[PDB]
Protein backbone atom coordinates (compact mmCIF):
# COMPACT_ATOMS: atom_id res chain seq x y z
CA UNK A 1 0.00 0.00 0.00
CA UNK A 2 2.98 2.34 0.58
CA UNK A 3 5.44 3.67 -1.99
CA UNK A 4 8.44 2.17 -0.15
CA UNK A 5 7.33 -1.28 -1.29
CA UNK A 6 7.57 -0.29 -4.99
CA UNK A 7 11.34 0.06 -5.24
CA UNK A 8 14.68 -1.61 -4.89
CA UNK A 9 17.29 0.51 -3.07
CA UNK A 10 20.91 1.17 -3.68
CA UNK A 11 23.26 0.36 -0.82
CA UNK A 12 23.63 4.16 -0.41
CA UNK A 13 19.89 4.81 -0.17
CA UNK A 14 19.32 1.87 2.15
CA UNK A 15 22.23 2.63 4.49
CA UNK A 16 21.29 6.36 4.63
CA UNK A 17 17.72 5.61 5.74
CA UNK A 18 19.06 3.17 8.33
CA UNK A 19 21.49 5.81 9.65
CA UNK A 20 18.78 8.55 9.72
CA UNK A 21 16.45 6.37 11.82
CA UNK A 22 19.29 5.22 14.08
CA UNK A 23 20.56 8.77 14.65
CA UNK A 24 16.96 9.75 15.50
CA UNK A 25 16.93 7.10 18.25
CA UNK A 26 20.17 8.32 19.68
CA UNK A 27 19.15 12.00 19.74
CA UNK A 28 15.84 11.26 21.46
CA UNK A 29 17.34 9.03 24.16
CA UNK A 30 20.19 11.49 24.74
CA UNK A 31 17.63 14.28 25.21
CA UNK A 32 15.64 11.97 27.56
CA UNK A 33 18.53 11.90 30.04
CA UNK A 34 18.79 15.69 29.90
CA UNK A 35 15.07 16.17 30.64
CA UNK A 36 15.19 13.64 33.47
CA UNK A 37 18.10 15.30 35.15
CA UNK A 38 16.76 18.87 34.81
CA UNK A 39 13.30 17.96 36.10
CA UNK A 40 14.49 18.42 39.76
CA UNK A 41 14.97 22.10 39.01
CA UNK A 42 11.38 22.65 37.88
CA UNK A 43 8.70 23.84 40.34
CA UNK A 44 5.78 21.50 41.01
CA UNK A 45 3.34 23.61 38.97
CA UNK A 46 5.39 22.95 35.80
CA UNK A 47 7.21 19.71 36.47
CA UNK A 48 4.70 17.61 34.51
CA UNK A 49 5.71 19.61 31.37
CA UNK A 50 9.25 18.31 31.76
CA UNK A 51 7.97 14.79 32.54
CA UNK A 52 5.95 14.95 29.27
CA UNK A 53 9.16 15.65 27.34
CA UNK A 54 10.62 12.43 28.84
CA UNK A 55 7.50 10.51 27.77
CA UNK A 56 7.67 11.97 24.22
CA UNK A 57 11.37 11.15 23.96
CA UNK A 58 10.88 7.44 24.79
CA UNK A 59 7.73 7.24 22.64
CA UNK A 60 9.36 8.81 19.60
CA UNK A 61 12.66 7.01 20.23
CA UNK A 62 10.85 3.63 20.39
CA UNK A 63 8.95 4.31 17.11
CA UNK A 64 12.15 5.30 15.38
CA UNK A 65 13.91 2.21 16.71
CA UNK A 66 10.96 0.11 15.57
CA UNK A 67 11.10 1.66 12.11
CA UNK A 68 14.82 1.04 11.90
CA UNK A 69 14.50 -2.67 12.71
CA UNK A 70 11.50 -3.04 10.35
CA UNK A 71 13.60 -1.42 7.58
CA UNK A 72 16.43 -3.87 8.07
CA UNK A 73 13.98 -6.82 8.40
CA UNK A 74 12.14 -5.92 5.22
CA UNK A 75 15.15 -5.61 2.81
CA UNK A 76 18.16 -7.77 1.91
CA UNK A 77 21.06 -7.23 -0.43
CA UNK A 78 20.29 -9.43 -3.49
CA UNK A 79 21.87 -9.25 -6.96
CA UNK A 80 23.43 -5.83 -6.29
CA UNK A 81 20.56 -3.95 -4.57
CA UNK A 82 18.40 -4.03 -1.46
CA UNK A 83 15.20 -5.86 -2.29
CA UNK A 84 11.95 -6.49 -0.44
CA UNK A 85 11.81 -9.80 1.45
CA UNK A 86 8.85 -11.23 3.35
CA UNK A 87 8.33 -8.56 5.95
CA UNK A 88 7.00 -5.14 5.06
CA UNK A 89 8.00 -1.54 5.98
CA UNK A 90 5.38 1.16 6.42
CA UNK A 91 5.06 4.66 7.87
CA UNK A 92 1.62 3.79 9.26
CA UNK A 93 3.06 3.06 12.64
CA UNK A 94 4.23 6.69 13.03
CA UNK A 95 0.63 7.81 12.55
CA UNK A 96 -0.56 5.51 15.32
CA UNK A 97 2.17 6.88 17.59
CA UNK A 98 1.15 10.49 16.96
CA UNK A 99 -2.17 9.64 18.61
CA UNK A 100 -0.17 9.68 21.87
CA UNK A 101 2.74 12.01 21.19
CA UNK A 102 0.79 14.95 19.75
CA UNK A 103 -1.47 15.27 22.83
CA UNK A 104 1.64 15.14 25.00
CA UNK A 105 3.32 17.97 23.05
CA UNK A 106 0.12 20.08 23.23
CA UNK A 107 -0.35 19.42 26.98
CA UNK A 108 3.15 20.54 27.87
CA UNK A 109 2.43 23.87 26.11
CA UNK A 110 -0.84 24.42 28.02
CA UNK A 111 1.00 23.77 31.30
CA UNK A 112 3.69 26.44 30.73
CA UNK A 113 1.02 28.82 29.53
CA UNK A 114 -0.29 28.65 33.14
CA UNK A 115 -3.67 27.31 32.16
CA UNK A 116 -5.37 25.41 34.89
CA UNK A 117 -8.60 23.96 36.03
CA UNK A 118 -11.51 24.05 33.75
CA UNK A 119 -9.87 26.11 31.08
CA UNK A 120 -7.00 23.58 30.92
CA UNK A 121 -9.30 20.52 30.71
CA UNK A 122 -11.59 22.10 28.11
CA UNK A 123 -8.69 23.43 26.01
CA UNK A 124 -6.86 20.06 26.14
CA UNK A 125 -10.04 18.23 25.13
CA UNK A 126 -10.69 20.33 22.05
CA UNK A 127 -7.00 20.24 21.02
CA UNK A 128 -6.85 16.46 21.37
CA UNK A 129 -10.01 15.98 19.36
CA UNK A 130 -8.68 18.22 16.59
CA UNK A 131 -5.30 16.39 16.70
CA UNK A 132 -7.00 12.98 16.49
CA UNK A 133 -9.16 14.11 13.60
CA UNK A 134 -6.06 15.24 11.76
CA UNK A 135 -4.12 12.06 12.49
CA UNK A 136 -6.92 9.60 11.69
CA UNK A 137 -7.84 11.30 8.44
CA UNK A 138 -4.19 11.43 7.44
CA UNK A 139 -3.69 7.73 8.33
CA UNK A 140 -6.56 6.83 6.03
CA UNK A 141 -5.29 9.02 3.23
CA UNK A 142 -1.80 7.48 3.23
CA UNK A 143 -3.33 3.97 2.62
CA UNK A 144 -3.99 5.30 -0.88
CA UNK A 145 -0.58 6.70 -1.66
CA UNK A 146 0.10 3.95 -4.25
CA UNK A 147 -3.42 3.01 -5.42
CA UNK A 148 -5.34 6.33 -5.50
CA UNK A 149 -3.45 9.66 -5.31
CA UNK A 150 -6.72 11.61 -5.67
CA UNK A 151 -7.99 9.96 -2.49
CA UNK A 152 -4.74 10.73 -0.77
CA UNK A 153 -5.27 14.42 -1.65
CA UNK A 154 -8.85 14.62 -0.48
CA UNK A 155 -8.17 12.91 2.86
CA UNK A 156 -5.17 15.24 3.06
CA UNK A 157 -7.41 18.30 2.66
CA UNK A 158 -9.74 17.11 5.42
CA UNK A 159 -6.72 16.50 7.63
CA UNK A 160 -5.31 19.93 6.84
CA UNK A 161 -8.60 21.50 7.96
CA UNK A 162 -8.21 19.88 11.37
CA UNK A 163 -4.53 21.01 11.39
CA UNK A 164 -5.42 24.62 10.67
CA UNK A 165 -8.12 24.66 13.37
CA UNK A 166 -5.72 23.07 15.89
CA UNK A 167 -3.07 25.67 15.07
CA UNK A 168 -5.64 28.45 15.53
CA UNK A 169 -6.49 27.08 19.01
CA UNK A 170 -2.80 26.94 19.88
CA UNK A 171 -2.04 30.49 18.62
CA UNK A 172 -5.13 31.87 20.24
CA UNK A 173 -4.11 30.48 23.65
CA UNK A 174 -0.48 31.48 23.24
CA UNK A 175 -1.15 35.10 22.30
CA UNK A 176 -3.86 35.41 24.97
CA UNK A 177 -1.84 33.97 27.87
CA UNK A 178 1.57 35.31 26.93
CA UNK A 179 0.86 38.18 29.44
CA UNK A 180 0.56 35.73 32.43
CA UNK A 181 4.08 34.43 31.86
CA UNK A 182 7.06 35.15 34.14
CA UNK A 183 10.75 35.77 33.80
CA UNK A 184 10.64 37.11 30.26
CA UNK A 185 9.10 33.91 28.90
CA UNK A 186 6.24 35.92 27.34
CA UNK A 187 8.81 36.60 24.61
CA UNK A 188 10.14 33.03 24.45
CA UNK A 189 6.70 31.50 24.04
CA UNK A 190 6.11 33.40 20.77
CA UNK A 191 9.18 31.68 19.31
CA UNK A 192 7.68 28.36 20.44
CA UNK A 193 4.57 29.12 18.35
CA UNK A 194 6.63 29.75 15.23
CA UNK A 195 8.78 26.69 15.82
CA UNK A 196 5.56 24.60 15.94
CA UNK A 197 4.19 26.24 12.75
CA UNK A 198 7.43 25.46 10.89
CA UNK A 199 8.17 21.93 12.26
CA UNK A 200 4.62 20.60 12.14
CA UNK A 201 4.17 21.74 8.50
CA UNK A 202 7.01 19.41 7.49
CA UNK A 203 4.72 16.43 8.13
CA UNK A 204 2.12 17.27 5.44
CA UNK A 205 4.97 17.99 3.07
CA UNK A 206 6.29 14.42 3.71
CA UNK A 207 2.73 13.15 3.27
CA UNK A 208 2.61 14.58 -0.28
CA UNK A 209 5.95 13.11 -1.44
CA UNK A 210 4.10 10.20 -3.26
CA UNK A 211 2.40 12.88 -5.36
CA UNK A 212 5.51 14.83 -6.44
CA UNK A 213 8.42 12.42 -6.05
CA UNK A 214 7.25 8.83 -6.47
CA UNK A 215 10.63 7.09 -6.65
CA UNK A 216 13.32 5.70 -4.38
CA UNK A 217 14.86 9.17 -3.82
CA UNK A 218 11.42 10.40 -2.74
CA UNK A 219 11.40 7.59 -0.15
CA UNK A 220 14.69 8.91 1.16
CA UNK A 221 13.42 12.54 1.14
CA UNK A 222 10.36 11.54 3.14
CA UNK A 223 12.47 9.88 5.90
CA UNK A 224 14.76 12.91 5.85
CA UNK A 225 11.80 15.29 6.36
CA UNK A 226 10.40 13.16 9.20
CA UNK A 227 13.85 13.29 10.81
CA UNK A 228 14.13 17.05 10.63
CA UNK A 229 10.51 17.35 11.81
CA UNK A 230 10.90 14.92 14.76
CA UNK A 231 14.01 16.58 16.05
CA UNK A 232 12.47 20.06 15.73
CA UNK A 233 9.00 19.24 16.98
CA UNK A 234 9.98 17.05 19.90
CA UNK A 235 13.55 17.72 20.97
CA UNK A 236 14.11 21.44 20.17
CA UNK A 237 10.54 22.11 21.22
CA UNK A 238 10.99 20.19 24.51
CA UNK A 239 14.20 22.05 25.22
CA UNK A 240 12.33 25.38 24.81
CA UNK A 241 9.40 24.17 26.92
CA UNK A 242 11.85 23.11 29.68
CA UNK A 243 13.76 26.43 29.52
CA UNK A 244 10.39 28.21 29.90
CA UNK A 245 9.39 25.97 32.81
CA UNK A 246 12.66 26.50 34.66
CA UNK A 247 12.65 30.28 34.03
CA UNK A 248 9.06 30.66 35.25
CA UNK A 249 9.93 28.46 38.26
CA UNK A 250 12.90 30.71 39.21
CA UNK A 251 10.74 33.87 38.80
CA UNK A 252 8.10 32.36 41.08
CA UNK A 253 10.76 31.78 43.78
CA UNK A 254 11.56 28.10 43.40
CA UNK A 255 15.06 27.94 44.86
CA UNK A 256 16.35 24.85 42.97
CA UNK A 257 15.50 26.66 39.69
CA UNK A 258 17.22 29.87 40.83
CA UNK A 259 20.29 27.90 41.85
CA UNK A 260 20.34 25.92 38.59
CA UNK A 261 20.11 29.08 36.48
CA UNK A 262 22.72 30.75 38.64
CA UNK A 263 25.39 28.09 38.18
CA UNK A 264 25.21 28.44 34.37
C1 LIG B 1 6.06 14.69 16.94
C2 LIG B 1 5.19 14.42 15.88
C3 LIG B 1 4.45 15.44 15.37
C4 LIG B 1 4.51 16.84 15.91
C5 LIG B 1 3.54 15.11 14.29
C6 LIG B 1 2.78 15.96 13.67
C7 LIG B 1 1.99 15.60 12.54
C8 LIG B 1 1.25 16.41 11.76
C9 LIG B 1 1.13 17.92 12.00
C10 LIG B 1 0.51 15.86 10.62
C11 LIG B 1 -0.24 16.49 9.79
C12 LIG B 1 -0.91 16.00 8.59
C13 LIG B 1 -1.52 16.89 7.79
C14 LIG B 1 -1.68 18.35 8.18
C15 LIG B 1 -2.08 16.61 6.44
C16 LIG B 1 -1.57 15.28 5.89
C17 LIG B 1 -1.74 14.23 6.92
C18 LIG B 1 -1.04 14.48 8.23
C19 LIG B 1 -1.50 13.62 9.39
C20 LIG B 1 0.42 14.14 7.93
C1 LIG C 1 17.16 20.09 13.04
C2 LIG C 1 18.10 19.43 12.04
C3 LIG C 1 18.08 17.93 12.04
C4 LIG C 1 19.06 17.38 11.00
C5 LIG C 1 18.90 15.88 10.78
C6 LIG C 1 19.50 15.40 9.47
C7 LIG C 1 20.97 15.23 9.50
C8 LIG C 1 21.40 14.34 8.29
C9 LIG C 1 21.82 15.19 7.07
C10 LIG C 1 22.10 14.62 5.84
C11 LIG C 1 22.50 15.38 4.59
C12 LIG C 1 22.29 14.63 3.27
C13 LIG C 1 23.24 13.53 3.03
C14 LIG C 1 23.32 13.09 1.59
C15 LIG C 1 22.24 12.16 1.05
C16 LIG C 1 22.83 11.07 0.16
C17 LIG C 1 21.77 10.63 -0.83
C18 LIG C 1 21.68 9.13 -1.09
O1 LIG C 1 22.45 8.48 -1.86
O2 LIG C 1 20.68 8.62 -0.58
C1 LIG D 1 23.18 5.98 18.43
C2 LIG D 1 23.12 7.24 17.59
C3 LIG D 1 24.28 8.18 17.85
C4 LIG D 1 24.41 8.57 19.33
C5 LIG D 1 23.80 9.96 19.56
C6 LIG D 1 24.47 10.64 20.75
C7 LIG D 1 24.79 12.10 20.52
C8 LIG D 1 23.73 12.98 21.19
C9 LIG D 1 23.71 14.37 20.59
C10 LIG D 1 22.69 15.31 20.74
C11 LIG D 1 21.40 15.00 21.47
C12 LIG D 1 20.52 16.23 21.80
C13 LIG D 1 20.23 16.32 23.29
C14 LIG D 1 20.11 17.76 23.73
C15 LIG D 1 20.47 17.93 25.22
C16 LIG D 1 20.70 19.38 25.59
C17 LIG D 1 21.66 20.05 24.62
C18 LIG D 1 22.19 21.32 25.19
O1 LIG D 1 22.03 21.56 26.44
O2 LIG D 1 22.77 22.06 24.33
C1 LIG E 1 21.03 6.45 31.02
C2 LIG E 1 21.21 5.76 32.19
C3 LIG E 1 21.76 6.32 33.45
C4 LIG E 1 20.87 7.49 33.87
C5 LIG E 1 20.53 7.58 35.31
C6 LIG E 1 20.22 9.03 35.66
C7 LIG E 1 19.72 9.19 37.08
C8 LIG E 1 19.20 10.60 37.36
C9 LIG E 1 19.00 10.80 38.85
C10 LIG E 1 18.22 12.07 39.15
O1 LIG E 1 18.22 13.07 38.34
O2 LIG E 1 17.62 12.08 40.25
C1 LIG F 1 -15.05 13.70 10.26
C2 LIG F 1 -14.54 13.14 8.92
C3 LIG F 1 -14.98 13.85 7.65
C4 LIG F 1 -14.63 13.20 6.51
C5 LIG F 1 -14.97 13.82 5.17
C6 LIG F 1 -14.93 12.91 3.97
C7 LIG F 1 -14.05 13.40 2.83
C8 LIG F 1 -12.99 12.31 2.59
C9 LIG F 1 -13.76 11.03 2.11
C10 LIG F 1 -13.10 10.45 0.88
C11 LIG F 1 -13.72 9.10 0.48
C12 LIG F 1 -13.37 8.68 -0.87
O1 LIG F 1 -12.46 9.36 -1.46
O2 LIG F 1 -13.94 7.66 -1.39
C1 LIG G 1 22.66 26.53 13.06
C2 LIG G 1 21.31 26.81 13.60
C3 LIG G 1 20.72 25.63 14.40
C4 LIG G 1 20.09 26.08 15.69
C5 LIG G 1 19.16 24.95 16.22
C6 LIG G 1 18.53 25.28 17.56
C7 LIG G 1 19.11 24.46 18.66
C8 LIG G 1 18.79 24.52 20.00
C9 LIG G 1 17.81 25.51 20.65
C10 LIG G 1 17.19 24.94 21.96
C11 LIG G 1 16.38 25.97 22.71
C12 LIG G 1 17.17 26.79 23.75
C13 LIG G 1 16.28 27.68 24.63
C14 LIG G 1 16.27 29.18 24.34
C15 LIG G 1 17.11 29.98 25.30
C16 LIG G 1 16.67 31.40 25.47
O1 LIG G 1 15.59 31.75 25.02
O2 LIG G 1 17.37 32.21 26.11
CL1 LIG H 1 4.67 25.21 42.25
CL1 LIG I 1 6.05 10.23 17.42
Author numbering: 2 to 265
Q: How did the manuscript describe this experimental structure?
A:
In contrast, the NTQ rhodopsin functions as a light-driven inward chloride pump (called ClR). Here we report the atomic crystal structure of ClR from the flavobacterium Nonlabens marinus S1-08T. The structure reveals two chloride ion-binding sites, one at the active centre of the pump and the other on a loop in the cytoplasmic side, suggesting the pathway of chloride ion movement in ClR. The ClR structure comprises a short N-terminal helix, seven transmembrane helices (TM A–TM G), a C-terminal helix and three loops connecting the transmembrane helices on both extracellular and cytosolic sides.
